[PDB]
Design a protein around this nucleic acid. Structure first.
Ligand SMILES: [Mg+2]
Ligand SMILES: [Zn+2]
Ligand SMILES: [Zn+2]
Ligand SMILES: [Zn+2]
Ligand SMILES: [Zn+2]
Ligand SMILES: [Zn+2]
Ligand SMILES: [Zn+2]
Lengths: 103, 103
DNA sequence: GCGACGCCCTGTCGCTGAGAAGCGTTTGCGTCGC
DNA sequence: GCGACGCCCTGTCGCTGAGAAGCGTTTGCGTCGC
């Protein structure tokens, strides 16, 4: 029951995907089917999340919303999506979410 | 895709289950459907395996065949099945299988 | 001390259930003679 | 050094793919006045 992690090439990031990056946590649209869960805030919403490009990454641990990457790590989702070598904070061992920081 | 770990009470261990404990690795009967995998030797066979009674155990990591528990840990499967508090070597942190010992 | 109301940077954790498995290439050792 | 054949305690590792996710109870702070 692990969601397959697919690495999206930087050249295939579209303008609509960039525009649908969340700019405020309260503006999110929840969808139990088409939404994607942010690893940090654990909300399943339809705004664009990051895509970890580490081949050894798995599941949703690499998916971060606009506000969460902005506020918890000082990184922009738009920059991460256009970064060919971007690795998620869990991959880098620097994730400060409520679960990863006690561990 | 994790096999549910069910704790079998000692009072419900039957005579047939005891008799079907493997006494020699070469006598095992392989069955891809009704067999059970031994965590140590990773063979899926129909001989009786151990049942870890630690509630926090999960999956097949607690299932050990007769010869493997006998040879790798000096414990008898019959004694382990009749032990109300028996915990698998992975739970005890003493598993010496090819995977757990490099880790 | 517990939570209101402004401020600026517009924000977060709890809980359950989660945490592989098994086919394939798989079976000890020591002392010999290839 | 690589693998045969006896011995006794009758035996084991490699590899792929595996390694949660998301609903619920969820949103910063400081300084006030309850
Ligand atoms: Mg799973
Ligand atoms: Zn988030
Ligand atoms: Zn990652
Ligand atoms: Zn984390
Ligand atoms: Zn075994
Ligand atoms: Zn166990
Ligand atoms: Zn092990």
């Amino acid at each position: 029951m692990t969601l397959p992690h697919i690495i999206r090439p930087v050249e295939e990031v579209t303008e609509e995907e960039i525009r649908n990056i969340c700019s405020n946590s309260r503006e999110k649209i929840y969808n139990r089917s088409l939404g994607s869960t942010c690893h940090q805030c654990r909300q399943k919403t339809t705004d664009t999340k990051t895509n970890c490009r580490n081949p050894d990454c798995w599941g949703i641990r690499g998916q971060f919303c606009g506000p969460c990457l902005r506020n918890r790590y000082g990184e922009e989702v738009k920059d991460a999506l256009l970064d060919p070598n971007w690795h998620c904070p869990p991959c880098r061992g620097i994730c400060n979410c409520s679960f990863c920081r006690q561990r």
